Structure formats: C-alpha cells, structure tokens
C-alpha cells in the first residue's frame, strides 16, 4: 500500500569509484569528500 | 470433511473403503433392489471368507488383486448423490453463500431494518473478542514443542472458555442460504 522508494542497498550501487566494477578496478577507491589527500 | 486426517490409512480402513466402493458400484450395476440384495449378500460372503486370516503379507496380496478386479469392472458411470462431489448439484448453491463480515459494510439505513438481528450480532462480536485472547494462549500452551503433529484442535477445558478457532466454523453461511 506504499510506493517503493530506494533504500540503502539500492543506494549503494552508485557509491563506488565507477559503475560496473571489474577485477582491475576493484581496488579503486572514491576520492576524499573534501578532495584533499593527506600530505603523508 | 469434519474429521482431521491421519498420516496414513491402516489395512482395515483400506479394506472397508474397498467394501463400500464395491457395494456402491454393484448397486449401480444392479438397478433393482432384490437383485442388489442378492449380489450384495454374495459379495459380503466373498469378502469375509478371508476375515480371520492372520499374516499380513498375503492379506496385502489380497486387496491388491481385489483393487485390480474392481478397476476392471467398476461401472464407468456410477450413481452419485446429487450433492456429492460428482453429483448434478454439487456446488449449485455456492453462489448464494455470503460471508458474515459483509454485514459490517451495510448502510445505516439498511441496518435500521432488522435491529434485533444486529444487536445479537454485536453480542456475538464481543464474545468473539474476549474468547480470542483466551484461545491464543490456550493453543500456545497446549501445543507440543516443534509445532503441531496433527491438524486436530482441542476443546475448551475451563468454564467460561470456548473451543479455540471456533468463529469461522460456528458462523458458516448455511447449506441452503437462499
């Protein structure tokens, strides 16, 4: 009796570095939120 | 229909079911009453000649040849009572059966007719409302762990109690509502 809306599991497919992950890309990580890399 | 079924039929039940089926089909073959009486007495004599036998193996060898002989001569058009599952009026009145809950959706101008009926109906509703809360716990404690083993239900054991799951059996529509 309720319209379906996206949930966390549905929202997680767009959270990767790219769409359609592969073996080569599997180790890629999204950029930081503020787009800053620690100086190390 | 009313009785809960078991896990299997014993040998005696199978024999009795064959006896009833064979007598019914013999009656369907022998239309006249005196002929049926004669051949039914003959079939009874044929049936109990092995009544006293003791071993299971041959007693099961019988009732197998008996089923084969019945299926060979089973009268492909046997007599069926009109209300029986194969009869000419099996589900004839099924379209006139209306559930009780439909009366809850009547207009107040409709319920204004028949005030006594609806007062009694309200009494029944409140009785059901209390009895249900009692029945749930009664069934919860009376059930073996792991779930029911047979779909048979217990009676009421206290004084003011009602048999669990009674509403939809007591409030059957009718056999011939209209």
């Amino acid at each position: 009796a309720r319209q379906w809306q996206p949930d966390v599991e549905w929202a997680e497919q767009f959270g990767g570095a790219v769409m359609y992950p592969t073996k080569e890309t599997a180790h890629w990580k999204p950029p930081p939120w503020n787009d800053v890399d620690p100086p190390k | 229909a009313f009785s809960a079924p078991a896990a299997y039929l014993t040998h005696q039940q199978k024999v009795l079911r064959l006896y009833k089926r064979a007598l019914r089909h013999l009656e369907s073959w022998c239309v006249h009453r005196d002929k049926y009486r004669y051949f039914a007495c003959l079939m009874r004599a044929r049936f109990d000649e092995h009544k006293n036998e003791k071993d299971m193996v041959k007693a099961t060898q019988l009732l197998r040849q008996a089923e084969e002989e019945f299926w060979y001569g089973q009268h492909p058009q046997p007599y069926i009572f009109p209300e029986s599952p194969g009869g000419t009026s099996y589900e004839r009145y099924e379209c006139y059966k209306v559930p009780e809950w439909c009366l809850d959706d009547w207009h107040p101008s409709e319920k204004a007719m028949y005030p006594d009926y609806f007062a009694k109906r309200e009494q029944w509703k409140r009785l059901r409302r209390e009895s249900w809360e009692r029945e749930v716990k009664q069934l919860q404690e009376e059930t073996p762990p792991g779930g029911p083993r047979t779909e048979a239900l217990p009676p009421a054991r206290k004084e003011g109690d009602l048999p669990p799951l009674w509403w939809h059996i007591v409030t059957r529509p009718r056999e011939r509502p209209m």
Partner: protein
C-alpha cells in the same frame, strides 16, 4: 483549431491557482467542457479536409482521435483521484500538469499539417509519460520500464527524422497536402528500401509490432492507472495515424516491402493471444490483448485498401475505449486487494454485482460481439484480408476463437466460483468507480448507432 488549444493551455493556470481542495472538481469540469467543444470537429466533408490555417488541419481520421483524446482526460482524473489522496498539493498539481501537457501535445500532433511538426510533437508526448511512469509508479520495476519505453521509441524515431529532412531536400516540402498532391512512385532500389524502412520503423515500434513489443507489457503493468489508460487508448494509435499518413509516398514499394511485417503480424496475433491464455497478471493480460488488436490494425494498414482503412480506424477507436475500461476495472480490484494477481480475489460477482455487470460488458466488447464497433472494424479488416488472400481467413479465424477464450477466462477467474475466505476488506463500489465505468461504456454503444463517424476519410 485554437478554440480547443487555448482552453487546454488555460487548464494549467487554472490548476495552479486553484484551491487545495478544489483541483479535481475544476479540472474535471473544464476538461468535460473542452471535450464538448471538441465534439464540433466531427462535422466533416467528403471533400479534402478542414484546413483551418497553414499549421493545423482536421480530417475524419483526425477528428475521432481528437475527440477520444479530449474525452480521456476527465476519466483519467477520476481514476487518479483515489490513489493520490495522501499526496501533497504541489505534487498533485504536478500530476495534473503532466496530464494536461500530454493532452496538449496529442491534440497538436493529430492536427499538425507538417511532417516535421508532427515528429516534434510525436516525440514531445514522451516526456510527460516517462515522468508519470517513473515518478508515480508503484513497484521498483518502473524505472526499468521507463527506460524501455524510452529507448525502443527513440531507436525507431531517430532514423525517421533523418529520412524526413532528406525528403524535404528532394521534394522541397513536408506539408501533407503538397506531399499528397505531388506524390511520385518509389522505384525498387536499395536506397529506396532503406528510406522505406526509416519511414516505417518508428511507427511500427509504437503500435507495437510483434517482436518489437517488449516495452509495452513492462510500461503498462508498471504505470499508474492514468498512465495505463493514456498509453493503451491514445499513444498506441499514434503509430497507426503516422503509418496511415506516410504510406502515400511509399508506393509501389509497399507492395513487396510489407511482406515481413504482415507475416510478423498475422502469426504474431496468434502468439500474443495464446500468451493471454497463460497469464497470472491482469494488467499483463490486457496489455497482450492490446498487442493482438494492434497487430490486426497493422495488417489493415499494410493491405492499403479502402475497407482496410475503414476497419483500422474503427478498430483503433473501439480498442482505445475497451482497453481503457478493462484497465480501470483491474485497477478498481487492485486498490482493494493490492496484489494484481488474477487468482487471489475470486468470486467477486457475489460481493460486487454491478461491477460484475461492468466486467461482463467490457469482456463482451473486447470479444467483438456484434453489432459493436469492435466487430465492425474486425470484420472490415478480415474482409479486406480475404480479398488480399483467401488463406488469411484461417489465421484470422483462429484469432477470433482464441480471443473469446481468454476474454471469458478473465471473466470467469475473477467473477465466478467461490469467494476467497480470508479476503474480508472488499468494500461496496463507490459512485466514482461506477460512473467511470458508465462513462467508458456508454460512448461505445452510442457510437454503434452512427458508425460513419469513426470509419475514417475513405467512407
């Protein structure tokens, strides 16, 4: 033609400046008034057309489609009133805005006198439908459904645009009157074959043609009720209208280019009909029946005879009304039961008798019982096909039988038998639903009295 277009545009500010509790009333009243105004287009001539201006013209092929389009809007509003109760005022106004924009685009598309203008509005009809499907649809499949409904369509219509501009660089005009009066034969050539395919495939994919029909069940089962109504009643007929218009420049290539599609239709109508025999969803069954009827319309248009065109017009109108009614009945069951599975709610004739009468009349009309206009169109198409080839009767005959079967199947599973015991929330039918069914079914039986109105320009 602006006497119809301007009030339809004025529907938008009227909707947006309305009170929060008066949107449905005002929209319904003014849509009914616009339908009454559009009724005057039915006065057609045996001569050329009603050429109002350089931009818009009306024909006895366009007039019934315009009347159906204007009549469908109040029914869609009534059908949408129920399930949109708990929605905010702004979103309800947006829904009504989408419906109005769809009606405006359809109105203009039918009356456009230019092929390019027709293409632009024919594509503009996509955006409101896509928004309606993917925003107010219920299940999660709607998104996928929308994608299908989009790309199929575009995959057919991008070549057409190319062909269109090519034609205008060769003939010098895309005006339909000039195109008709200056028609020239198409020689048998590979370039001409591909031009034919480009001009035909966009309209084939929206009928839909068998084998290109996969988008339709998805879109129709995933759409809200108003979306299903407009998709089945009007948007399918855009391909038929386009093919009727564009076949004038495709001769005599159609004499042999039509063979692959004709087969795909004549066999296809069998398959889809048989598919209706084994279906567990009501909306899916109704959509597949729509596919079968539109296959018959495709055959009629490809045969290219006067009786074929008359039958195709009549069948388009009749199917629009009938499929809209069937979708409304299925939705009135769904809003009570929330399942959309045929065998869940059973024996409903005992609980809802008048709705059972509506079900019977809708099933009889879909079954093409004479003298309904459904049967008029079907019989004219069948006679034209018999003249085309006497063997066709076999396939046609088979379809008829199968159709009746599944129609009555749908009537027997849901209405007859014993009621489901545990379903105790089936309330009496509202006046709104009964009025919706009556307003669907009375125009059909009225139209059977004056069939010349829906027989097209070749009457």
């Amino acid at each position: 033609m602006l006497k119809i277009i301007i009030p339809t545009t004025m529907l938008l500010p009227m909707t947006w400046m309305s009170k929060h509790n008066m949107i449905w009333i005002n929209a319904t009243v003014h849509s009914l008034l616009i339908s009454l105004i559009s009724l005057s287009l039915l006065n057609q001539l045996g001569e050329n057309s009603l050429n109002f201006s350089l931009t818009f013209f009306s024909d006895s092929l366009s007039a019934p489609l315009l009347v159906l389009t204007t009549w469908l809007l109040p029914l869609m509003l009534m059908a949408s009133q129920s399930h949109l109760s708990k929605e905010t005022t702004t979103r309800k106004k947006l829904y009504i805005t989408m419906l109005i924009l769809l009606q405006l685009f359809l109105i203009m598309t039918f009356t456009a006198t230019e092929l390019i203008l027709f293409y632009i509005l024919f594509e503009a009809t996509l955006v409101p439908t896509l928004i309606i499907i993917t925003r107010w649809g219920n299940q999660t499949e709607r998104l996928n459904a929308g994608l299908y409904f989009l790309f199929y369509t575009l995959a057919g219509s991008l070549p057409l645009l190319v062909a269109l501009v090519y034609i205008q660089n060769t003939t010098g005009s895309l005006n339909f009157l000039i195109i008709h009066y200056w028609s020239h034969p198409l020689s048998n050539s590979w370039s001409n074959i591909f031009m034919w395919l480009a001009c035909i495939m966009a309209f084939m994919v929206k009928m839909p043609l068998y084998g290109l029909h996969l988008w339709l069940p998805k879109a129709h089962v995933e759409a809200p009720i108003a979306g299903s109504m407009v998709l089945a009643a009007v948007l399918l007929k855009l391909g038929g209208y386009g093919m009727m218009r564009i076949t004038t420049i495709l001769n005599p290539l159609t004499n042999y280019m039509a063979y692959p599609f004709l087969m795909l239709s004549m066999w296809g109508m069998i398959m889809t009909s048989s598919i209706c025999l084994r279906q567990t969803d009501l909306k899916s069954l109704i959509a597949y029946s729509s596919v079968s009827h539109m296959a018959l319309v495709i055959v009629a248009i490809m045969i290219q005879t006067p009786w074929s065109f008359m039958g195709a017009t009549a069948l388009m109108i009749a199917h629009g009304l009938t499929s809209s009614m069937l979708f409304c009945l299925a939705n009135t069951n769904y809003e009570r039961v929330h399942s959309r599975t045929m065998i869940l709610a059973r024996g409903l004739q005992t609980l809802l008798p008048l709705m059972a009468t509506w079900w019977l009349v809708a099933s009889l009309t879909n079954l093409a019982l004479p003298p309904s206009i459904n049967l008029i169109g079907e019989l004219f198409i069948i006679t034209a096909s018999f003249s085309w080839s006497n063997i066709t009767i076999i396939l046609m005959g088979m379809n008829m039988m199968i159709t009746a079967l599944y129609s009555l199947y749908m009537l027997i599973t849901t209405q007859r038998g014993k009621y489901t015991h545990h379903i105790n929330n089936i309330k009496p039918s509202f006046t709104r639903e009964n009025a919706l069914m009556a307003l669907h079914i009375l125009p059909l039986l009225l139209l059977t009295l004056n069939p010349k109105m829906i027989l097209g320009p070749l009457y």
